[PDB]
């Protein structure tokens, strides 16, 4: 029943597809996830079995000679289906003790038939146009949030430096008070034992002007700290908005890809595909 | 801005002067004035305020204030003016100067060049940073001793190095244009203070030495030849044809113009006790406890759960299965569980890394997404296994990265602490656990092969078949077993090393130890092959060490300058700050000022990027400390670019709702001011440091049509022989857009051109200068007499208009050479753009020169970046040759597709396409080295796979050639005549 099945009708056979398409399907998949494709026309061999083991894609090549397939000489198996279905049941430890794993989870090319069950070609073409427009809308929404995200990140970093620059400026003005306090102790004492309130008036006026300027600089730093908390909240808010759109973008893209895959299958004219996408 | 909250301060501005007696004098002063002027006005007015008795003389004191970067900067150079000071707020404190004044100047100059203060490095508490600063000075002091060894000639070789090609040998078509292997060259000599010009036209062999060229001129030692226009000198004894200026003049067919100058003239211009344990003694499996994450910016309603994805990685390759934590709510991120990895602690390789991320998740279907990420080196820079508890502040996910982990990204904590902070705990066995020495590894290698258990013709041909696979062509498990089985026989074909390295079980100290012994006595390979072993898939210190020593032996300063962009970006993949590659690059940067120029600018351009600020900042410090006299020239460039940033920021932000002529009046007014005139005149071009930029042609400077407001600038060439080469230098400054993709694309075009010229195909490309210098800041070279296709043929609702213009500009018997140059130009750019997959070419993108040379501008996105948001798998053709272009090739024929010229044109495209296909490894390696750059177009190996599809590397040479023909035919709708 199973071994009499053709290689074309097999779920795990994907035909002429690139190694990149195989990598996308096997990315973040469990051990024993697999699919077969046509080999590179440059290199020897007919087909390439690509399976998962230890979070890595293991490429095992299937050779052919005189009606017999296999991984190396001697070629024992009758067909590719017999080779695969054997290692679906039995372990690959038989071939090589390194990769003790079965071909457990076939990446079906009838997987998209579950996601897009509707049969009509024009109906699938219109839904691809609809899903692509939802993707393009969400993508431009994400890009606009990322423009704000980077600009808000930079402006926070500008403000963060300015807080330290305000604090160094306050330190210098506080050091000026320390300079005024210690040197004016002895001099004001000379101008108090002598009658010279004229001099005290314009020294204490100068001391008030210093302390008044410190209050203004401390206010400007205090106002900036509120703007930092204001803008830091905008960064966290934008990041939250992006993290809700992120999962939607993957689901829309993966669905759009599987809809485009279903029309890549049953080959549609590239003119028609570009009209629906645009 | 020049004062925090303001772009430019107005002429009248108040300043709070803080005297050392304790008083505070508010002072009126003009914006243009200097510190010596302000100090004169200060102590004059200080008499009126109290305690002026205690004040000393004006010369005794120095001004001090806070800068934009929160540094207490002391202003020794009192000729500097108020707007150029970069003050935080308008105040100045006078005190008496103290400490080493020689060092404080140099630390400020280095701090201005780098883009952050040197005092920030002093307050770093990581011991790897301070070890680097002290240890890297060994290379700096080694470098300066090399250029001082054969003084003063070796000092002149540093400042004015010989800009030469890699090989003295010439191609056939280059050599055949000479008169029986001779070139006619004009040597000029300056006469007097009157300075009127007289020339001596010579005719001599192409491979003469600069000494021998001088000897022939004295008919019609003790002297040197300089290129007229540039600051470029032929000091070294290379063949005359090997210099790029002379080689370019042969191709262009122009008279080379040199200036005779005295050797003495140029030379005068320049001056508790520890308990250590070995890793292989620890008999235990690896386990890492994930305690808790402080917070993460997640909407409580939308996301279902959050967890910590985790994995042990050797480069991109996971050493074992990725382990997740349990799924917990968003409000309370807390785990406290030992994650068990299926790997033995001894089997952990030297470059093993923990890669982790906090991930959000949304009939049992769910979308997993990365929130934040971070990587840790399991072994630190001193070979010590990480142990105990530590915090890791995670980085933001880059734009478009849909992978749950980020192995390619840099290791270490985010310096920004207002950030998601994952706390984790490693095991603790003793105080220190070390990775073993090479001597101990050799013993285990011999021990391993001892317990284990003729190169045939069929097997020997398989090693050549496997070695011909491209870097990203994945080797099979049979090929892995085969390569490993014949690992001792692989030394005879040393270019197979990268395939052999991927066949090693890196999660197995047995096989790693045996590979270490092979790498130790591996035959060296060509630098272009060795650059493959510097990418993110070869993180092992020995493998990288081998690669660097191949560059030390065989990488010429031509090829180092050629490939410098990729080598700087490769430092991001390095685990540790101190390494062999950074020492190699820094030494070459300090022994060659051409290399050191762009080395500075490539690092300087990414100092905004916090992923590499510390590494690149520390590396720039080492350079700026040791580069000597060129630091002064670089600060003039930096100050010039920073002032151009200020004006464009005002135009983008403040003058957004203003007409373009009103913006010109503002631009001309601010550029006319003396502080702008001093900064933006008399400095070297960052696009080429040989090019001297004199006074601004300020009337001819313009703003461009884009909304980001680029400046079309125009400088005088102050060289006294400028009339021979070029009288003005035009550069396009740009503030809004990222020009790293154009910089890379134009680098590749130059490399593609160089491949074709060496292989016989005379296909003249035009890789114009394009240098990125900051966060979306860059410069672009202006090609003289360059016209877009739109300019020749006016838009409105004829095909032959292009051919008519070209015949007028190149009338007479010269016509045929112009059609040849046009046809050859189109061929290279048709092939180049198809391979690289650049943006779609329209009439504004395509440009043509008067002599007939066609070229492209504004590459932008590439590798078909719009195959996201567009599900198609077809490889599109950007540069489609319409009827307008085919008439020019076919010379006015109506059936232009069925001519001998078009057939001849097709043959060039095929020969050009196969030439790049045969050098596919180089370009794949070059793109692989840029994967950590942060460019949206080069984030993963899936993005680089586009050039494999266009070059058709999984197919035969004849199949790939057949593939190329089909893509041209589908784009041309049958116009591209098929071979049938
Ligand atoms: O490599 C690039 C990238 C971009 N990207 C967008 C951009 C950048 C600056 C100004 C306007 C648009 C533009 C150019 C670019 N190059 C130009 N050239 C450079 C070569 O010599 C002739 C003048 C342009 O002449 C008129 C427009 C324009 N745009 C080149």
Swiss-Prot record, chain A:
PTM section of the record: Polyubiquitinated in T-cells by CBLB; which does not promote proteasomal degradation but impairs association with CD28 and CD3Z upon T-cell activation.
Tissue/organ expression: Isoform 2 is expressed in skeletal muscle and brain, and at lower levels in kidney and cardiac muscle. Isoform 2 and isoform 4 are present in skeletal muscle (at protein level).
Effect the entry attributes to changing residue 5 to I = Does not affect insulin-stimulated lipid kinase activity
| Domain SH2 span(s) in chain numbering | 12-107
Tell me the outcome of changing residue 168 to K.
In SHORTS; there is 70 to 90% reduction in the effect of insulin on AKT1 activation, glycogen synthesis and glucose uptake, indicating severe insulin resistance for both proximal and distal PI3K-dependent signaling
Q: Which residues carry this modification: Phosphotyrosine?
A: 146, 259
| Subunit structure as annotated in this protein's UniProt entry | Heterodimer of a regulatory subunit PIK3R1 and a p110 catalytic subunit (PIK3CA, PIK3CB or PIK3CD). Interacts (via SH2 domains) with CCDC88A/GIV (tyrosine-phosphorylated form); the interaction enables recruitment of PIK3R1 to the EGFR receptor, enhancing PI3K activity and cell migration. Interacts (via SH2 domain) with CSF1R (tyrosine phosphorylated). Interacts with PIK3R2; the interaction is dissociated in an insulin-dependent manner. (Microbial infection) Interacts with HIV-1 Nef to activate the Nef associated p21-activated kinase (PAK). This interaction depends on the C-terminus of both proteins and leads to increased production of HIV.
What is this protein's function? Binds to activated (phosphorylated) protein-Tyr kinases, through its SH2 domain, and acts as an adapter, mediating the association of the p110 catalytic unit to the plasma membrane. Necessary for the insulin-stimulated increase in glucose uptake and glycogen synthesis in insulin-sensitive tissues. Plays an important role in signaling in response to FGFR1, FGFR2, FGFR3, FGFR4, KITLG/SCF, KIT, PDGFRA and PDGFRB. Likewise, plays a role in ITGB2 signaling.
- Family, similarity comment: Belongs to the PI3K p85 subunit family.
Q: What is known of its domains?
A: The SH3 domain mediates the binding to CBLB, and to HIV-1 Nef.
Q: What is this protein called?
A: Phosphatidylinositol 3-kinase regulatory subunit alpha
Specify the species: Homo sapiens
Which gene is transcribed and translated to give this protein? PIK3R1
From Swiss-Prot, chain B:
CDD domains membership: C2_PI3K_class_I_alpha, PI3Ka_I, PI3Kc_IA_alpha
Q: Look up what happens after changing residue 478 to E.
A: In BC; uncertain significance
Consequence of substituting residue 968 to I: In MCAP and CRC; also found in an endometrial carcinoma sample; shows an increase in lipid kinase activity
The main enzyme category here is transferase
Annotated region (Catalytic loop) at 837-845
Q: What is the effect of changing residue 972 to R?
A: In CLOVE, KERSEB, CRC, BC, OC, MADAC, CCM4 and HFMH; also found in an endometrial carcinoma sample; somatic mutation; shows an increase in lipid kinase activity; oncogenic in vivo; requires binding to p85 regulatory subunit to induce cellular transformation but not interaction with RAS; may mimic the conformatitonal change triggered by the interaction with RAS; enhances invadopodia-mediated extracellular matrix degradation and invasion in breast cancer cells; may alter the interaction of the PI3K/PI4K kinase domain with the cell membrane; increased AKT and RPS6 phosphorylation in HFMH patient's cell
Recorded disease is:
PIK3CA mutations are involved in various type of cancer. Most of the cancer-associated mutations are missense mutations and map to one of the three hotspots: Glu-474; Glu-477 and His-972. Mutated isoforms participate in cellular transformation and tumorigenesis induced by oncogenic receptor tyrosine kinases (RTKs) and HRAS/KRAS. Interaction with HRAS/KRAS is required for Ras-driven tumor formation. Mutations increasing the lipid kinase activity are required for oncogenic signaling. The protein kinase activity may not be required for tumorigenesis. Colorectal cancer: A complex disease characterized by malignant lesions arising from the inner wall of the large intestine (the colon) and the rectum. Genetic alterations are often associated with progression from premalignant lesion (adenoma) to invasive adenocarcinoma. Risk factors for cancer of the colon and rectum include colon polyps, long-standing ulcerative colitis, and genetic family history.
Q: What does this protein do?
A: Phosphoinositide-3-kinase (PI3K) phosphorylates phosphatidylinositol (PI) and its phosphorylated derivatives at position 3 of the inositol ring to produce 3-phosphoinositides. Uses ATP and PtdIns(4,5)P2 (phosphatidylinositol 4,5-bisphosphate) to generate phosphatidylinositol 3,4,5-trisphosphate (PIP3). PIP3 plays a key role by recruiting PH domain-containing proteins to the membrane, including AKT1 and PDPK1, activating signaling cascades involved in cell growth, survival, proliferation, motility and morphology. Participates in cellular signaling in response to various growth factors.
Q: Any idea what this protein is called?
A: Phosphatidylinositol 4,5-bisphosphate 3-kinase catalytic subunit alpha isoform
